[PDB]
Amino acid sequence: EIVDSFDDMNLSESLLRGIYAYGFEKPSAIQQRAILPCIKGYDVIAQAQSGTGKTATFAISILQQIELDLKATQALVLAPTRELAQQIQKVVMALGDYMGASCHACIGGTNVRAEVQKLQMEAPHIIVGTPGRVFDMLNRRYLSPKYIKMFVLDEADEMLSRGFKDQIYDIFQKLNSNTQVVLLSATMPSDVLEVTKKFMRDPIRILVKKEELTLEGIRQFYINVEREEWKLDTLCDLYETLTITQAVIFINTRRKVDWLTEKMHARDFTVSAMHGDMDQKERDVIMREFRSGSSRVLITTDLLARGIDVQQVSLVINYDLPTNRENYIHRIGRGGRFGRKGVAINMVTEEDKRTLRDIETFYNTSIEEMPLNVADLI
RNA sequence: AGAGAGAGAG
Ligand SMILES: COc1ccc([C@@]23Oc4cc(OC)cc(OC)c4[C@]2(O)[C@H](O)[C@H](C(=O)N(C)C)[C@H]3c2ccccc2)cc1
Ligand SMILES: Nc1ncnc2c1ncn2[C@@H]1O[C@H](COP(=O)(O)OP(=O)(O)NP(=O)(O)O)[C@@H](O)[C@H]1O
Ligand SMILES: [Mg+2]
């Protein structure tokens, strides 16, 4: 079961070289548990707390299985958003730096002609993509399922949700029967675990009790606002705390992201906005500026709730409380990456603290009123 | 279911 060193995982020498060149020294808890079953070829359901290294868990496993002399697509990774798929593609490339493995990002919003040209020239070893564009390229037969032996759903419970399950099933239908299936997520509700019985062969389940999901290093607070109409002034009062670090402010609708961004611009606050109705070129610019520290404060929808890794984020503001319990863990998990200290602030009206209490009891976690000392916890 | 949030091309 447990293996506490990358040197003890029978990895290729050049793969191990890429891990160490990337900055990793010891495998995290989930890497100690899940990499070997995945490399062995078992179907695996791998759950672990936010920010504990689930990407490299499947990235290392995929890279170790690739036949580099076989110029065909051998592994397919799906993610719910374009920004996450792009982030994963970069991690795979960095860990495979000394291997000569090809990994291509297959996502909506990018130039179709250029991608078709590339795919027809050479079949990448690894595809990381979003379901729409991947299915499109399968349908056009510019991607071939012929040699795909590994199929990974990151954020798997979102990939099996109401809007994604049919998309995943249409892709799975084009895959060979013997394809290995690996699922990863911070959250794995029992209804999701049930449906995995339809397409996974007695998988290895590496699970986490929901009452043990919250990270000790992320202090959760609430701010009484009483009325929705005072949230704007409360956020502006927090601004100089938001900019100590980098902060993400979560909003439940695209429309309100635009509303809040303009209100804060009108008061001369420097903030960036992010949601799915922006052009992909706009989305890429905003994400790049945030990753580089050029912009410190991001107002966004749940587009960025899952998987996005920006080490410098240590503050998450739930301006709107999430209507999905599982989504709460993902949102606050944008801070406190890989053991770092983080803070989550929930802005709660009267009608809201009913929801906050349900969150508290779901995760067996206590969310106290925000202290005046909070700028020092950043 | 739907809404919300995402998720091909044109
Ligand atoms: C012929 O090749 C196709 C390729 C993709 C699609 C789609 O991909 C997207 C992606 C989207 O990002 C904005 C929007 C969208 O529609 C608004 C679509 C779709 O057209 C539509 O929603 C499809 C869907 O889920 N249906 C029918 C219940 C979806 C889909 C994705 C993956 C696998 C199957 C289907 C449709 C056809
Ligand atoms: N073994 C490791 N040693 C050091 N840093 C690591 C290691 N594994 C992962 N990390 C870093 O930890 C951060 C979080 O990794 P990531 O793969 O995004 O976690 P995650 O479990 O997928 N988070 P999430 O999807 O939001 O639940 C990244 O900055 C990684 O580079
Ligand atoms: Mg992740």
Side-chain angles (χ1 to χ4, degrees), chain A residues 225-305:
Chain A
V225 200
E226 160 93 22
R227 311 149 197 272
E228 172 73 32
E229 294 88 0
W230 188 248
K231 285 189 176 183
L232 168 66
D233 285 296
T234 309
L235 182 61
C236 293
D237 283 336
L238 292 176
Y239 184 80
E240 62 295 321
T241 303
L242 304 175
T243 49
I244 299 167
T245 175
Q246 294 184 266
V248 182
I249 302 155
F250 279 107
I251 304 273
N252 286 357
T253 62
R254 301 168 178 189
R255 178 159 118 205
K256 193 158 158 193
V257 164
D258 288 346
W259 175 90
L260 175 60
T261 305
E262 282 314 305
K263 292 294 214 191
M264 289 192 77
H265 288 169
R267 295 187 197 188
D268 296 332
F269 290 111
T270 295
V271 295
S272 299
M274 182 78 175
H275 59 70
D277 206 28
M278 304 164 50
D279 290 338
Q280 196 53 39
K281 72 156 152 33
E282 305 178 70
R283 286 165 62 165
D284 292 348
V285 160
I286 294 296
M287 273 304 288
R288 168 167 60 74
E289 291 178 351
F290 192 67
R291 275 185 202 279
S292 70
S294 150
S295 49
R296 303 187 87 63
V297 177
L298 199 51
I299 307 168
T300 182
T301 59
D302 288 314
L303 176 60
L304 305 187

Coordinates of all heavy atoms in Angstrom, one line a residue, chain A residues 225-305:
Chain A
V225 N -23.5 40.2 7.2 CA -23.8 41.4 6.4 C -25.3 41.7 6.5 O -25.7 42.8 6.0 CB -23.4 41.2 5.0 CG1 -23.3 42.5 4.2 CG2 -22.1 40.4 4.9
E226 N -26.1 40.8 7.1 CA -27.6 41.1 7.3 C -28.3 41.2 6.0 O -29.3 40.4 5.7 CB -27.8 42.3 8.1 CG -29.2 43.0 8.0 CD -30.1 42.5 9.1 OE1 -29.7 42.0 10.2 OE2 -31.3 42.6 8.9
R227 N -28.0 42.1 5.1 CA -28.7 42.3 3.8 C -27.7 42.1 2.7 O -26.5 42.5 2.7 CB -29.3 43.7 3.7 CG -30.2 44.0 4.9 CD -30.2 45.5 5.1 NE -30.6 45.9 6.5 CZ -31.9 46.1 6.8 NH1 -32.8 46.0 5.9 NH2 -32.2 46.4 8.1
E228 N -28.2 41.6 1.6 CA -27.4 41.5 0.3 C -26.8 42.8 -0.1 O -25.7 42.9 -0.5 CB -28.3 40.9 -0.8 CG -27.6 40.9 -2.2 CD -26.5 39.8 -2.3 OE1 -26.6 38.8 -1.7 OE2 -25.5 40.1 -3.0
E229 N -27.7 43.9 0.0 CA -27.3 45.2 -0.5 C -26.1 45.8 0.2 O -25.6 46.8 -0.3 CB -28.5 46.1 -0.3 CG -29.7 45.8 -1.2 CD -30.6 44.8 -0.5 OE1 -30.4 44.4 0.6 OE2 -31.7 44.4 -1.1
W230 N -25.6 45.3 1.4 CA -24.4 45.8 2.0 C -23.2 45.0 1.7 O -22.1 45.3 2.1 CB -24.7 45.8 3.5 CG -23.5 46.5 4.2 CD1 -22.6 45.9 5.1 CD2 -23.2 47.9 4.1 NE1 -21.7 46.9 5.5 CE2 -22.0 48.1 4.9 CE3 -23.7 49.0 3.4 CZ2 -21.4 49.3 5.1 CZ3 -23.1 50.2 3.6 CH2 -22.0 50.4 4.4
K231 N -23.3 43.9 0.9 CA -22.1 43.1 0.6 C -21.1 43.9 -0.2 O -19.9 43.8 0.1 CB -22.6 41.9 -0.2 CG -23.2 40.8 0.7 CD -23.4 39.5 -0.1 CE -24.0 38.4 0.8 NZ -24.1 37.1 0.1
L232 N -21.5 44.7 -1.1 CA -20.6 45.5 -1.9 C -19.7 46.4 -1.0 O -18.5 46.4 -1.2 CB -21.3 46.4 -2.9 CG -20.5 47.5 -3.6 CD1 -19.5 46.9 -4.5 CD2 -21.5 48.4 -4.4
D233 N -20.3 47.1 -0.1 CA -19.5 48.0 0.8 C -18.6 47.2 1.7 O -17.5 47.6 2.0 CB -20.4 48.9 1.6 CG -21.0 50.0 0.8 OD1 -20.2 50.9 0.3 OD2 -22.3 50.1 0.6
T234 N -19.1 46.0 2.2 CA -18.3 45.2 3.0 C -17.0 44.7 2.3 O -15.9 44.7 2.8 CB -19.1 44.0 3.5 OG1 -20.3 44.4 4.1 CG2 -18.3 43.2 4.6
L235 N -17.2 44.3 1.0 CA -16.1 43.8 0.2 C -15.1 44.9 0.0 O -13.9 44.7 0.2 CB -16.6 43.3 -1.1 CG -15.4 42.7 -2.0 CD1 -14.7 41.6 -1.3 CD2 -15.9 42.3 -3.3
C236 N -15.5 46.1 -0.3 CA -14.6 47.2 -0.5 C -13.9 47.6 0.8 O -12.7 47.9 0.7 CB -15.4 48.5 -1.0 SG -16.1 48.2 -2.7
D237 N -14.5 47.5 1.9 CA -13.8 47.7 3.2 C -12.7 46.6 3.4 O -11.7 46.9 4.0 CB -14.8 47.6 4.3 CG -15.6 48.8 4.5 OD1 -15.2 49.9 4.0 OD2 -16.7 48.8 5.1
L238 N -12.8 45.5 2.8 CA -11.8 44.4 2.9 C -10.6 44.6 2.0 O -9.7 43.8 2.1 CB -12.4 43.0 2.7 CG -13.4 42.6 3.8 CD1 -14.0 41.2 3.4 CD2 -12.7 42.5 5.1
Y239 N -10.7 45.6 1.1 CA -9.8 45.5 -0.1 C -8.3 45.4 0.2 O -7.6 44.6 -0.3 CB -10.0 46.8 -1.0 CG -9.2 46.7 -2.3 CD1 -9.6 45.9 -3.3 CD2 -8.0 47.3 -2.4 CE1 -8.9 45.8 -4.5 CE2 -7.2 47.2 -3.6 CZ -7.7 46.4 -4.6 OH -6.9 46.3 -5.8
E240 N -7.9 46.2 1.2 CA -6.4 46.2 1.5 C -6.0 44.9 2.2 O -4.8 44.6 2.2 CB -6.1 47.4 2.4 CG -6.8 47.5 3.7 CD -8.3 47.7 3.6 OE1 -8.7 48.5 2.8 OE2 -9.0 47.1 4.4
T241 N -7.0 44.2 2.7 CA -6.6 42.8 3.2 C -6.6 41.8 2.0 O -5.7 41.0 2.0 CB -7.7 42.3 4.2 OG1 -7.8 43.3 5.3 CG2 -7.3 41.0 4.7
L242 N -7.4 42.0 1.0 CA -7.4 41.2 -0.2 C -6.1 41.2 -0.9 O -5.6 40.2 -1.4 CB -8.5 41.6 -1.1 CG -10.0 41.6 -0.6 CD1 -10.9 42.2 -1.7 CD2 -10.4 40.3 -0.2
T243 N -5.4 42.4 -0.9 CA -4.2 42.6 -1.7 C -2.9 42.3 -0.9 O -1.9 42.4 -1.5 CB -4.2 44.0 -2.2 OG1 -4.4 44.9 -1.1 CG2 -5.2 44.3 -3.2
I244 N -3.0 41.9 0.4 CA -1.8 41.4 1.1 C -1.2 40.3 0.3 O 0.0 40.1 0.3 CB -2.2 40.9 2.5 CG1 -2.8 42.1 3.3 CG2 -1.0 40.3 3.2 CD1 -3.5 41.6 4.6
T245 N -2.0 39.5 -0.4 CA -1.6 38.3 -1.1 C -2.2 38.3 -2.5 O -2.0 39.2 -3.2 CB -2.1 37.1 -0.2 OG1 -1.9 35.9 -0.9 CG2 -3.7 37.3 0.0
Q246 N -2.8 37.2 -2.9 CA -3.8 37.2 -3.9 C -5.1 36.6 -3.4 O -5.0 35.7 -2.5 CB -3.3 36.4 -5.2 CG -2.1 37.1 -5.9 CD -1.7 36.4 -7.1 OE1 -0.8 35.5 -7.1 NE2 -2.4 36.7 -8.2
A247 N -6.2 37.0 -3.9 CA -7.5 36.6 -3.4 C -8.4 36.3 -4.6 O -8.3 36.9 -5.7 CB -8.2 37.7 -2.5
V248 N -9.3 35.3 -4.4 CA -10.4 35.0 -5.3 C -11.7 35.2 -4.6 O -11.9 34.7 -3.5 CB -10.2 33.5 -5.8 CG1 -11.3 33.2 -6.8 CG2 -8.9 33.2 -6.4
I249 N -12.6 35.9 -5.3 CA -13.9 36.2 -4.8 C -14.9 35.5 -5.7 O -15.1 35.7 -6.9 CB -14.2 37.7 -4.9 CG1 -13.1 38.5 -4.0 CG2 -15.6 38.0 -4.3 CD1 -12.9 39.9 -4.5
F250 N -15.7 34.6 -5.0 CA -16.6 33.7 -5.8 C -18.0 34.2 -5.8 O -18.5 34.7 -4.8 CB -16.6 32.3 -5.2 CG -15.4 31.4 -5.7 CD1 -14.3 31.2 -4.8 CD2 -15.4 31.0 -7.0 CE1 -13.3 30.4 -5.2 CE2 -14.3 30.2 -7.4 CZ -13.2 29.9 -6.5
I251 N -18.6 34.2 -7.0 CA -19.9 34.7 -7.3 C -20.7 33.7 -8.0 O -20.1 33.0 -8.9 CB -19.8 36.0 -8.1 CG1 -19.0 37.1 -7.4 CG2 -21.2 36.6 -8.4 CD1 -19.7 37.9 -6.4
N252 N -22.0 33.6 -7.8 CA -22.8 32.5 -8.3 C -23.3 32.7 -9.8 O -23.7 31.7 -10.4 CB -24.0 32.2 -7.4 CG -23.6 31.5 -6.1 OD1 -22.5 31.2 -5.9 ND2 -24.6 31.3 -5.3
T253 N -23.2 33.9 -10.3 CA -23.6 34.1 -11.7 C -22.7 35.0 -12.5 O -22.0 35.9 -11.9 CB -25.0 34.8 -11.8 OG1 -25.0 36.1 -11.2 CG2 -26.1 33.9 -11.1
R254 N -22.5 34.7 -13.8 CA -21.8 35.6 -14.7 C -22.3 37.0 -14.5 O -21.5 38.0 -14.5 CB -21.9 35.1 -16.1 CG -21.4 33.7 -16.4 CD -21.9 33.3 -17.8 NE -21.4 32.0 -18.3 CZ -21.6 31.5 -19.5 NH1 -22.1 32.3 -20.4 NH2 -21.1 30.3 -19.8
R255 N -23.6 37.2 -14.5 CA -24.2 38.6 -14.5 C -23.7 39.3 -13.3 O -23.3 40.5 -13.4 CB -25.7 38.5 -14.5 CG -26.3 39.9 -14.4 CD -27.8 39.8 -15.0 NE -28.7 40.2 -13.9 CZ -30.0 39.8 -14.0 NH1 -30.4 39.0 -14.9 NH2 -30.8 40.1 -13.0
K256 N -23.6 38.7 -12.1 CA -23.2 39.4 -10.9 C -21.7 39.6 -10.9 O -21.2 40.6 -10.3 CB -23.7 38.7 -9.7 CG -23.6 39.5 -8.4 CD -24.6 38.9 -7.4 CE -24.3 39.2 -6.0 NZ -25.0 38.3 -5.0
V257 N -20.9 38.8 -11.5 CA -19.5 39.0 -11.6 C -19.2 40.4 -12.4 O -18.5 41.2 -11.9 CB -18.7 37.9 -12.3 CG1 -17.3 38.3 -12.8 CG2 -18.6 36.7 -11.4
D258 N -19.9 40.5 -13.5 CA -19.8 41.8 -14.2 C -20.3 43.0 -13.4 O -19.7 44.0 -13.5 CB -20.6 41.7 -15.6 CG -19.9 40.8 -16.6 OD1 -18.7 40.4 -16.4 OD2 -20.6 40.4 -17.6
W259 N -21.4 42.8 -12.7 CA -22.0 43.9 -11.9 C -21.0 44.3 -10.8 O -20.7 45.5 -10.7 CB -23.3 43.4 -11.3 CG -23.9 44.4 -10.3 CD1 -24.8 45.4 -10.6 CD2 -23.7 44.5 -8.9 NE1 -25.1 46.1 -9.5 CE2 -24.4 45.5 -8.4 CE3 -22.9 43.7 -8.0 CZ2 -24.5 45.9 -7.1 CZ3 -22.9 44.1 -6.7 CH2 -23.7 45.1 -6.2
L260 N -20.4 43.3 -10.1 CA -19.5 43.6 -9.0 C -18.2 44.2 -9.5 O -17.7 45.1 -8.9 CB -19.3 42.4 -8.1 CG -18.3 42.5 -7.0 CD1 -18.7 43.6 -6.0 CD2 -18.0 41.2 -6.3
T261 N -17.7 43.7 -10.6 CA -16.5 44.2 -11.1 C -16.6 45.7 -11.5 O -15.7 46.5 -11.3 CB -16.0 43.4 -12.3 OG1 -16.0 42.0 -12.0 CG2 -14.7 43.8 -12.8
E262 N -17.7 46.1 -12.1 CA -17.9 47.5 -12.6 C -18.1 48.4 -11.4 O -17.5 49.5 -11.3 CB -19.0 47.6 -13.5 CG -18.6 47.2 -15.0 CD -17.3 47.7 -15.4 OE1 -17.1 49.0 -15.4 OE2 -16.4 46.9 -15.8
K263 N -18.8 47.9 -10.4 CA -19.0 48.7 -9.1 C -17.6 49.0 -8.5 O -17.4 50.1 -8.0 CB -19.9 48.0 -8.1 CG -21.4 47.9 -8.6 CD -22.0 49.3 -8.6 CE -23.5 49.2 -8.2 NZ -24.2 50.5 -8.5
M264 N -16.8 48.0 -8.4 CA -15.5 48.2 -7.8 C -14.5 49.0 -8.6 O -13.7 49.8 -8.1 CB -14.9 46.8 -7.4 CG -15.6 46.1 -6.3 SD -14.7 44.7 -5.6 CE -13.5 45.5 -4.6
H265 N -14.6 48.9 -9.9 CA -13.8 49.8 -10.8 C -14.3 51.2 -10.6 O -13.5 52.1 -10.6 CB -14.0 49.3 -12.3 CG -13.2 48.1 -12.6 ND1 -13.4 47.4 -13.8 CD2 -12.3 47.4 -11.9 CE1 -12.6 46.3 -13.8 NE2 -11.9 46.3 -12.7
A266 N -15.6 51.4 -10.5 CA -16.2 52.7 -10.3 C -15.7 53.4 -9.0 O -15.7 54.6 -8.9 CB -17.7 52.7 -10.3
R267 N -15.3 52.6 -8.0 CA -14.7 53.1 -6.8 C -13.1 53.0 -6.8 O -12.5 53.1 -5.8 CB -15.2 52.4 -5.6 CG -16.7 52.6 -5.3 CD -17.0 52.0 -4.0 NE -18.4 51.8 -3.8 CZ -19.0 51.4 -2.7 NH1 -18.2 51.1 -1.6 NH2 -20.3 51.2 -2.6
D268 N -12.6 52.8 -8.0 CA -11.1 52.8 -8.2 C -10.4 51.7 -7.5 O -9.3 51.8 -7.1 CB -10.5 54.2 -7.8 CG -11.0 55.3 -8.7 OD1 -11.3 55.1 -9.8 OD2 -11.0 56.5 -8.2
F269 N -11.1 50.5 -7.4 CA -10.4 49.3 -6.9 C -9.9 48.5 -8.1 O -10.6 48.3 -9.0 CB -11.3 48.5 -6.0 CG -11.6 49.2 -4.7 CD1 -12.9 49.7 -4.4 CD2 -10.7 49.3 -3.7 CE1 -13.2 50.3 -3.2 CE2 -10.9 50.0 -2.5 CZ -12.2 50.5 -2.3
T270 N -8.7 48.0 -8.0 CA -8.1 47.2 -9.0 C -8.5 45.7 -8.8 O -8.0 45.1 -7.9 CB -6.6 47.4 -9.1 OG1 -6.2 48.7 -9.4 CG2 -5.9 46.4 -10.1
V271 N -9.3 45.2 -9.7 CA -9.8 43.9 -9.6 C -10.1 43.4 -11.1 O -10.4 44.1 -12.0 CB -11.1 43.7 -8.8 CG1 -10.9 44.1 -7.4 CG2 -12.2 44.6 -9.4
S272 N -9.9 42.1 -11.3 CA -10.1 41.4 -12.6 C -11.3 40.5 -12.5 O -11.6 40.0 -11.4 CB -8.9 40.7 -13.0 OG -7.7 41.5 -13.2
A273 N -11.9 40.3 -13.6 CA -13.1 39.4 -13.7 C -12.9 38.3 -14.6 O -12.1 38.3 -15.5 CB -14.4 40.2 -14.1
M274 N -13.6 37.2 -14.3 CA -13.4 35.9 -15.0 C -14.7 35.1 -15.0 O -15.2 34.8 -14.0 CB -12.3 35.1 -14.3 CG -11.9 33.8 -15.0 SD -10.9 34.0 -16.4 CE -10.6 32.3 -16.9
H275 N -15.2 34.8 -16.2 CA -16.3 33.9 -16.3 C -16.4 33.4 -17.7 O -15.6 33.8 -18.6 CB -17.6 34.5 -15.8 CG -18.0 35.7 -16.6 ND1 -18.5 35.7 -17.9 CD2 -18.1 37.0 -16.3 CE1 -18.8 36.9 -18.3 NE2 -18.6 37.7 -17.3
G276 N -17.3 32.4 -18.0 CA -17.4 31.6 -19.2 C -17.9 32.3 -20.4 O -17.8 31.8 -21.5
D277 N -18.5 33.5 -20.2 CA -19.0 34.2 -21.4 C -18.0 35.2 -21.9 O -18.3 35.9 -22.9 CB -20.3 35.0 -21.0 CG -21.2 35.2 -22.2 OD1 -21.1 34.4 -23.2 OD2 -22.0 36.2 -22.2
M278 N -16.8 35.2 -21.4 CA -15.7 36.0 -22.0 C -15.1 35.2 -23.2 O -15.2 34.0 -23.2 CB -14.6 36.4 -21.0 CG -15.2 37.1 -19.8 SD -14.2 37.2 -18.3 CE -12.7 37.8 -18.9
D279 N -14.5 35.9 -24.1 CA -13.8 35.2 -25.2 C -12.6 34.4 -24.6 O -12.1 34.8 -23.5 CB -13.2 36.2 -26.2 CG -14.3 36.9 -27.0 OD1 -15.4 36.3 -27.2 OD2 -14.0 38.0 -27.6
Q280 N -12.3 33.3 -25.2 CA -11.2 32.5 -24.7 C -9.9 33.3 -24.6 O -9.1 33.1 -23.7 CB -11.0 31.2 -25.5 CG -10.2 30.2 -24.8 CD -10.7 29.9 -23.4 OE1 -11.9 29.8 -23.2 NE2 -9.8 29.7 -22.5
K281 N -9.7 34.2 -25.6 CA -8.5 35.0 -25.5 C -8.5 35.9 -24.3 O -7.4 36.2 -23.7 CB -8.3 35.8 -26.8 CG -9.3 37.0 -27.0 CD -8.7 38.1 -27.9 CE -9.8 38.8 -28.6 NZ -11.0 38.9 -27.8
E282 N -9.6 36.4 -23.9 CA -9.8 37.2 -22.7 C -9.5 36.3 -21.5 O -8.8 36.7 -20.6 CB -11.1 37.8 -22.6 CG -11.6 38.7 -23.7 CD -13.0 39.2 -23.4 OE1 -13.2 40.1 -22.5 OE2 -14.0 38.7 -24.1
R283 N -10.1 35.1 -21.5 CA -9.9 34.2 -20.3 C -8.4 33.9 -20.2 O -7.9 33.9 -19.0 CB -10.7 32.9 -20.6 CG -12.2 33.1 -20.4 CD -13.1 32.0 -20.9 NE -12.8 30.7 -20.3 CZ -13.6 29.6 -20.4 NH1 -14.7 29.6 -21.1 NH2 -13.2 28.5 -19.8
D284 N -7.7 33.6 -21.3 CA -6.3 33.3 -21.2 C -5.5 34.5 -20.6 O -4.6 34.3 -19.8 CB -5.8 32.9 -22.5 CG -6.3 31.5 -23.0 OD1 -7.0 30.8 -22.2 OD2 -6.2 31.2 -24.2
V285 N -5.8 35.7 -21.1 CA -5.1 36.8 -20.6 C -5.3 37.0 -19.1 O -4.3 37.1 -18.3 CB -5.5 38.1 -21.4 CG1 -5.2 39.4 -20.6 CG2 -4.9 38.2 -22.7
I286 N -6.5 36.9 -18.6 CA -6.8 37.1 -17.2 C -6.1 36.1 -16.4 O -5.5 36.4 -15.4 CB -8.3 37.1 -17.0 CG1 -9.0 38.3 -17.6 CG2 -8.6 37.1 -15.5 CD1 -8.5 39.7 -17.1
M287 N -6.2 34.8 -16.8 CA -5.6 33.7 -16.1 C -4.0 33.9 -16.0 O -3.4 33.7 -14.9 CB -5.9 32.4 -16.7 CG -7.2 31.8 -16.2 SD -7.2 31.6 -14.4 CE -6.1 30.2 -14.2
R288 N -3.4 34.3 -17.1 CA -2.0 34.5 -17.1 C -1.6 35.6 -16.2 O -0.6 35.5 -15.4 CB -1.5 34.8 -18.6 CG -0.1 35.3 -18.7 CD 0.4 35.2 -20.1 NE -0.4 36.0 -21.1 CZ -0.4 37.3 -21.1 NH1 0.4 38.0 -20.3 NH2 -1.2 38.0 -22.0
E289 N -2.3 36.8 -16.2 CA -2.0 37.9 -15.4 C -2.2 37.5 -13.9 O -1.4 38.0 -13.1 CB -2.9 39.1 -15.7 CG -2.6 39.7 -17.1 CD -3.5 40.9 -17.4 OE1 -4.5 41.1 -16.7 OE2 -3.3 41.6 -18.4
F290 N -3.2 36.7 -13.6 CA -3.4 36.3 -12.2 C -2.3 35.4 -11.7 O -1.7 35.5 -10.6 CB -4.7 35.7 -12.0 CG -5.1 35.5 -10.6 CD1 -5.4 36.5 -9.8 CD2 -5.3 34.2 -10.0 CE1 -5.8 36.4 -8.4 CE2 -5.7 34.0 -8.7 CZ -5.9 35.1 -7.9
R291 N -1.9 34.4 -12.6 CA -0.8 33.5 -12.2 C 0.5 34.1 -12.0 O 1.3 33.7 -11.1 CB -0.7 32.4 -13.3 CG -1.6 31.2 -13.2 CD -1.3 30.2 -14.3 NE -2.5 29.4 -14.5 CZ -2.8 28.3 -13.7 NH1 -2.1 28.0 -12.7 NH2 -3.9 27.7 -14.0
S292 N 0.8 35.2 -12.7 CA 2.1 35.9 -12.6 C 2.1 36.9 -11.5 O 3.2 37.5 -11.2 CB 2.4 36.6 -13.9 OG 1.5 37.7 -14.1
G293 N 1.0 37.1 -10.8 CA 0.9 38.1 -9.7 C 0.7 39.5 -10.3 O 0.7 40.5 -9.5
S294 N 0.6 39.7 -11.6 CA 0.3 41.0 -12.1 C -1.0 41.6 -11.6 O -1.1 42.8 -11.3 CB 0.2 40.9 -13.7 OG -0.7 41.9 -14.2
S295 N -2.0 40.7 -11.4 CA -3.3 41.1 -10.8 C -3.4 40.2 -9.5 O -3.1 39.0 -9.5 CB -4.5 40.8 -11.7 OG -4.4 39.5 -12.3
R296 N -3.8 40.9 -8.4 CA -3.9 40.3 -7.1 C -5.3 39.8 -6.7 O -5.4 38.9 -5.9 CB -3.4 41.2 -6.0 CG -1.9 41.7 -6.3 CD -1.3 42.5 -5.1 NE -0.7 41.6 -4.1 CZ 0.4 40.9 -4.3 NH1 0.9 40.8 -5.5 NH2 0.9 40.2 -3.3
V297 N -6.4 40.3 -7.3 CA -7.7 40.1 -6.9 C -8.6 39.7 -8.1 O -8.7 40.5 -9.0 CB -8.3 41.3 -6.1 CG1 -9.8 41.0 -5.8 CG2 -7.5 41.6 -4.9
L298 N -9.2 38.5 -8.0 CA -10.0 38.0 -9.1 C -11.4 37.7 -8.7 O -11.6 37.0 -7.7 CB -9.3 36.7 -9.6 CG -9.7 36.1 -11.0 CD1 -9.5 37.2 -12.0 CD2 -8.8 34.9 -11.2
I299 N -12.4 38.3 -9.4 CA -13.8 38.0 -9.2 C -14.2 37.0 -10.2 O -13.9 37.3 -11.4 CB -14.6 39.3 -9.2 CG1 -14.1 40.4 -8.3 CG2 -16.1 39.0 -8.9 CD1 -14.7 41.8 -8.5
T300 N -14.9 36.0 -9.8 CA -15.1 34.9 -10.8 C -16.3 34.0 -10.4 O -16.7 34.1 -9.2 CB -13.8 34.0 -10.8 OG1 -14.0 32.9 -11.7 CG2 -13.5 33.4 -9.4
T301 N -16.8 33.3 -11.3 CA -17.8 32.3 -11.1 C -17.1 31.0 -10.7 O -15.9 30.9 -10.5 CB -18.6 32.0 -12.4 OG1 -17.7 31.6 -13.4 CG2 -19.3 33.3 -12.8
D302 N -17.9 29.9 -10.5 CA -17.4 28.6 -10.3 C -16.5 28.0 -11.4 O -16.0 26.9 -11.3 CB -18.5 27.6 -9.9 CG -19.1 27.9 -8.5 OD1 -18.3 28.1 -7.6 OD2 -20.3 27.9 -8.4
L303 N -16.4 28.8 -12.5 CA -15.4 28.4 -13.5 C -14.0 28.1 -12.9 O -13.3 27.2 -13.3 CB -15.2 29.6 -14.5 CG -14.2 29.5 -15.6 CD1 -14.5 28.2 -16.5 CD2 -14.1 30.7 -16.5
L304 N -13.6 28.9 -11.8 CA -12.4 28.7 -11.2 C -12.5 28.0 -9.8 O -11.5 28.0 -9.1 CB -11.7 30.0 -11.0 CG -11.5 30.8 -12.3 CD1 -10.6 32.1 -12.0 CD2 -10.8 30.0 -13.4
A305 N -13.6 27.4 -9.5 CA -13.8 26.7 -8.2 C -13.0 25.5 -8.1 O -12.5 25.1 -7.0 CB -15.3 26.4 -8.0

